[PDB]
Design an enzyme around this catalytic site. Sequence first.
Site, PDB file in Angstrom:
ATOM      1  N   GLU A   1      33.469  41.940  25.853  1.00 43.33           N
ATOM      2  CA  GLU A   1      32.730  42.482  26.975  1.00 43.33           C
ATOM      3  C   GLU A   1      32.580  43.945  27.009  1.00 43.33           C
ATOM      4  OE1 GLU A   1      34.986  42.284  30.757  1.00 43.33           O
ATOM      5  OE2 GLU A   1      33.195  41.822  31.838  1.00 43.33           O
TER       6      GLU A   1
ATOM      7  N   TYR B   1      26.351  47.085  34.998  1.00 44.79           N
ATOM      8  CA  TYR B   1      27.337  47.856  34.035  1.00 44.79           C
ATOM      9  C   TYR B   1      26.800  48.704  33.078  1.00 44.79           C
ATOM     10  CZ  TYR B   1      30.654  45.222  37.015  1.00 44.79           C
ATOM     11  OH  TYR B   1      31.307  44.701  37.937  1.00 44.79           O
TER      12      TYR B   1
ATOM     13  N   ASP C   1      38.867  39.818  42.437  1.00 47.64           N
ATOM     14  CA  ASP C   1      39.287  38.227  42.219  1.00 47.64           C
ATOM     15  C   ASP C   1      40.758  38.452  41.229  1.00 47.64           C
ATOM     16  OD1 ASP C   1      37.880  35.362  40.802  1.00 47.64           O
ATOM     17  OD2 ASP C   1      40.039  35.814  41.269  1.00 47.64           O
TER      18      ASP C   1
ATOM     19  N   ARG D   1      36.070  47.684  44.295  1.00 46.40           N
ATOM     20  CA  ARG D   1      35.643  47.217  45.446  1.00 46.40           C
ATOM     21  C   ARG D   1      35.953  46.034  45.902  1.00 46.40           C
ATOM     22  NH1 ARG D   1      32.141  43.684  45.725  1.00 46.40           N
ATOM     23  NH2 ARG D   1      30.677  43.074  44.241  1.00 46.40           N
TER      24      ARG D   1
ATOM     25  N   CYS E   1      31.906  45.342  40.563  1.00 47.52           N
ATOM     26  CA  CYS E   1      33.243  45.442  41.109  1.00 47.52           C
ATOM     27  C   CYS E   1      34.002  46.481  40.636  1.00 47.52           C
ATOM     28  CB  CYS E   1      33.862  43.916  40.570  1.00 47.52           C
ATOM     29  SG  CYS E   1      32.747  42.425  40.778  1.00 47.52           S
TER      30      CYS E   1
ATOM     31  N   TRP F   1      29.698  35.567  31.386  1.00 51.58           N
ATOM     32  CA  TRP F   1      28.842  35.998  32.455  1.00 51.58           C
ATOM     33  C   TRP F   1      27.391  34.806  32.265  1.00 51.58           C
ATOM     34  CZ3 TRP F   1      28.396  39.815  35.824  1.00 51.58           C
ATOM     35  CH2 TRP F   1      29.330  40.744  35.768  1.00 51.58           C
TER      36      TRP F   1
HETATM   37  N1  LIG Z   1      34.041  35.040  41.323  1.00 51.23           N
HETATM   38  C1  LIG Z   1      33.676  35.905  40.183  1.00 51.23           C
HETATM   39  N2  LIG Z   1      34.856  36.659  39.762  1.00 51.23           N
HETATM   40  C2  LIG Z   1      34.520  37.373  38.396  1.00 51.23           C
HETATM   41  O1  LIG Z   1      35.702  38.124  38.283  1.00 51.23           O
HETATM   42  C3  LIG Z   1      33.265  37.604  37.878  1.00 51.23           C
HETATM   43  C4  LIG Z   1      32.934  38.330  36.915  1.00 51.23           C
HETATM   44  C5  LIG Z   1      33.633  39.176  35.957  1.00 51.23           C
HETATM   45  C6  LIG Z   1      33.923  38.828  34.382  1.00 51.23           C
HETATM   46  C7  LIG Z   1      34.638  37.632  34.372  1.00 51.23           C
HETATM   47  C8  LIG Z   1      34.216  36.236  34.529  1.00 51.23           C
HETATM   48  C9  LIG Z   1      35.101  35.207  34.468  1.00 51.23           C
HETATM   49  C10 LIG Z   1      36.320  35.317  33.887  1.00 51.23           C
HETATM   50  C11 LIG Z   1      36.795  33.999  33.557  1.00 51.23           C
HETATM   51  O2  LIG Z   1      36.550  32.762  33.948  1.00 51.23           O
HETATM   52  N3  LIG Z   1      38.360  33.919  32.827  1.00 51.23           N
HETATM   53  C12 LIG Z   1      38.940  32.651  32.427  1.00 51.23           C
HETATM   54  C13 LIG Z   1      38.408  31.865  31.306  1.00 51.23           C
HETATM   55  C14 LIG Z   1      37.590  32.712  30.413  1.00 51.23           C
HETATM   56  C15 LIG Z   1      37.035  32.066  28.910  1.00 51.23           C
HETATM   57  O3  LIG Z   1      37.826  31.654  28.179  1.00 51.23           O
HETATM   58  O4  LIG Z   1      35.695  31.720  28.973  1.00 51.23           O
HETATM   59  C16 LIG Z   1      40.512  33.001  32.407  1.00 51.23           C
HETATM   60  O5  LIG Z   1      41.433  32.270  32.692  1.00 51.23           O
HETATM   61  O6  LIG Z   1      40.644  34.222  31.827  1.00 51.23           O
HETATM   62  C17 LIG Z   1      36.979  36.628  33.308  1.00 51.23           C
HETATM   63  C18 LIG Z   1      35.988  37.612  33.394  1.00 51.23           C
HETATM   64  C19 LIG Z   1      31.450  37.954  36.893  1.00 51.23           C
HETATM   65  N4  LIG Z   1      31.183  36.898  37.551  1.00 51.23           N
HETATM   66  C20 LIG Z   1      32.152  36.771  38.593  1.00 51.23           C
HETATM   67  N5  LIG Z   1      32.612  36.038  39.648  1.00 51.23           N
HETATM   68  C1  LIG Z   2      33.596  40.873  39.984  1.00 50.90           C
HETATM   69  C2  LIG Z   2      33.729  41.462  38.547  1.00 50.90           C
HETATM   70  C3  LIG Z   2      34.740  41.959  38.012  1.00 50.90           C
HETATM   71  O1  LIG Z   2      34.985  42.689  37.024  1.00 50.90           O
HETATM   72  N1  LIG Z   2      35.980  41.884  39.014  1.00 50.90           N
HETATM   73  C4  LIG Z   2      36.118  40.805  39.865  1.00 50.90           C
HETATM   74  O2  LIG Z   2      37.209  40.384  39.810  1.00 50.90           O
HETATM   75  N2  LIG Z   2      34.989  40.573  40.424  1.00 50.90           N
HETATM   76  C5  LIG Z   2      35.039  39.445  41.295  1.00 50.90           C
HETATM   77  C6  LIG Z   2      35.065  39.836  42.780  1.00 50.90           C
HETATM   78  C7  LIG Z   2      34.517  38.634  43.325  1.00 50.90           C
HETATM   79  O3  LIG Z   2      35.051  37.539  43.426  1.00 50.90           O
HETATM   80  C8  LIG Z   2      33.073  38.430  42.801  1.00 50.90           C
HETATM   81  C9  LIG Z   2      31.935  39.578  43.386  1.00 50.90           C
HETATM   82  O4  LIG Z   2      31.733  38.979  44.331  1.00 50.90           O
HETATM   83  P1  LIG Z   2      31.211  40.144  45.549  1.00 50.90           P
HETATM   84  O5  LIG Z   2      29.880  40.805  44.964  1.00 50.90           O
HETATM   85  O6  LIG Z   2      32.143  40.885  45.684  1.00 50.90           O
HETATM   86  O7  LIG Z   2      30.901  39.257  46.613  1.00 50.90           O
HETATM   87  O8  LIG Z   2      33.443  38.627  41.520  1.00 50.90           O
END
Ligand SMILES: Nc1nc(=O)c2c(CCc3ccc(C(=O)N[C@@H](CCC(=O)O)C(=O)O)cc3)c[nH]c2[nH]1
Ligand SMILES: *c1cc(=O)[nH]c(=O)n1[C@H]1C[C@H](O)[C@@H](COP(=O)(O)O)O1
Lengths: 286, 286
Positions: free
Chosen positions: A60, A108, A191, A188, A168, A82
Amino acid sequence: HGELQYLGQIQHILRCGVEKDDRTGTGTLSVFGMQARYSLRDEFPLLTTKRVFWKGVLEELLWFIKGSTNAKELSSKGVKIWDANGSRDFLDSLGFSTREEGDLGPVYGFQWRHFGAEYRDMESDYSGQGVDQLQRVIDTIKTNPDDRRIIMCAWNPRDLPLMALPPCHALCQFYVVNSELSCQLYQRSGDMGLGVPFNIASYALLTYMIAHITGLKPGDFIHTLGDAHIYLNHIEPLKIQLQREPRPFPKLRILRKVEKIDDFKAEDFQIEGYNPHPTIKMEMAV
Amino acid sequence: HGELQYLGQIQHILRCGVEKDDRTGTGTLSVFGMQARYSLRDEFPLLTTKRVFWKGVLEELLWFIKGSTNAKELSSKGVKIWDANGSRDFLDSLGFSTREEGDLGPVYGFQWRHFGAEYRDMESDYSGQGVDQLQRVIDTIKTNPDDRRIIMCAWNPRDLPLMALPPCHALCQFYVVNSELSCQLYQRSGDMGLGVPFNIASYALLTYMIAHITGLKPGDFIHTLGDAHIYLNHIEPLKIQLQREPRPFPKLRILRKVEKIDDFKAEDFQIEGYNPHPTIKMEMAV
Ligand SMILES: Nc1nc(=O)c2c(CCc3ccc(C(=O)N[C@@H](CCC(=O)O)C(=O)O)cc3)c[nH]c2[nH]1
Ligand SMILES: *c1cc(=O)[nH]c(=O)n1[C@H]1C[C@H](O)[C@@H](COP(=O)(O)O)O1
Ligand SMILES: Nc1nc(=O)c2c(CCc3ccc(C(=O)N[C@@H](CCC(=O)O)C(=O)O)cc3)c[nH]c2[nH]1
Ligand SMILES: *c1cc(=O)[nH]c(=O)n1[C@H]1C[C@H](O)[C@@H](COP(=O)(O)O)O1
């Protein structure tokens, strides 16, 4: 040690965190405003109470650095994280029907290298356009480490309406003292179950990279959260993780001398001594 | 109580901060990464171990809200705090010889109300141009307080080269829960002796204002520092202040019902029960 800071926030959110609704339809328990200091001195903060997907992390970051905003270019490396936000259904729900699947918009990558640039599509040629904050940082650290403005900002009020999902981790600042480089990040939205573990490792990596190119040793990584939350369907998995005992953080070795930040390839890095607890699956809220 | 958080940081910087050179030529003792939580519930955090220039605070905020970037418009209210950075010598040292004295460039005010706008001069008409983050915030708080993106960002990578002095308080985010409004701020650079006492009171005021307009009660104000420093010529004055004992914070009463944030005038506010220790002069590093 360091991983205790994270585990602490998870618990704090669970006991006191207030239940709050979110845009994804899932439920949430949240707290507003937190901060943790992770040391990059002779250790890389890759959580041990769970096995973190290091590959997607590295992949990433690299994806970000080359300024790509196409989910598909990353899904090509075996990191599907993503794809969800680049789907046709999701793009359409935002009204981006004319947009091609995979085009996240001006997020980003695009902001780090072409902040001012006028966005077109995930395949346009932006070189030479907009300001390159990343390089800018590197050069400032090299010529005047006392500078109190070494900042890289992804939050771009003007481009928001075209982003599949706003940053985020929206802003980070670097600092130098005694030949060691530190970085603080403003997230901001956080998760706690998924992104955060990723985020923390991602910036600790970025710091190591820049410290390498500048000839400085990593200092600390300050993680600042805005809306830190634990999704409802993450509560049980997290409750178990909170029960596991952390292990010493591994080390991040850089197998080669690199000059320009764009030279780095996945092969230049290697994690040592990573002995984490078993994996824990958690469903990403869309 | 609350003022103890501040006093703590001052001491920590003194006993553990490293000596560091800065752009102003003065010396510095600095720490990187701090956070303090100030409660706005039935109290306004206006330091008591010293008498703070509340007027300049209120006047400055108002100056920001109407999006002005002219030191003279503030100096007109009897608040000279920005004149220094708007001088001819200072403007010229930055190479802004063609610029008129007092024109700070596209700073605080301009970014809050016209982020995207293309800057011209401290007297140009920007109405209708760029994005108005302030109003944006207000409306989001009013229609969807669960929103995890209520952000106002002054840091604008593209305009930096034209600012007499980049934002120290570069980004803040709001949060809502149980009908009470909280605000966190990211301050990349923090002059602990002068600006910080001002900064803290400034955002606590902004919060009160927005909470009023939205019909919510103030929650907490989270102050996050990046490069928090104590200038060398501030060390002795601070050492004495650290010795004084704090008093209960005063209260901020709003003498009238206001609808739009631009309606607020200096007269609409009033501080009650402010009993601080004697003043302490400290020289601002230019
Ligand atoms: N709600 C929400 N939160 C986020 O953080 C986010 C993002 C940030 C990037 C991101 C998304 C998913 C996982 C992830 O799923 N990680 C897992 C498994 C990864 C894999 O093997 O594909 C984990 O347990 O780390 C790890 C990082 C984009 N859209 C999002 N939406
Ligand atoms: C966004 C991307 C990242 O790198 N880190 C995160 O934890 N997130 C999470 C926060 C939230 O679950 C969602 C973005 O939702 P929103 O735009 O804040 O409503 O991904
Ligand atoms: N180095 C530096 N620090 C800053 O905080 C700053 C600023 C912020 C505005 C500012 C400047 C001076 C004082 C100030 O002087 N406050 C005094 C009293 C002022 C008066 O009597 O009008 C105080 O004791 O707080 C208070 C606030 C702009 N450029 C700066 N450069
Ligand atoms: C800037 C503006 C503000 O409201 N708060 C502050 O305390 N400051 C301080 C930070 C630093 O001391 C100086 C700006 O210097 P530099 O741009 O970081 O070199 O003013």
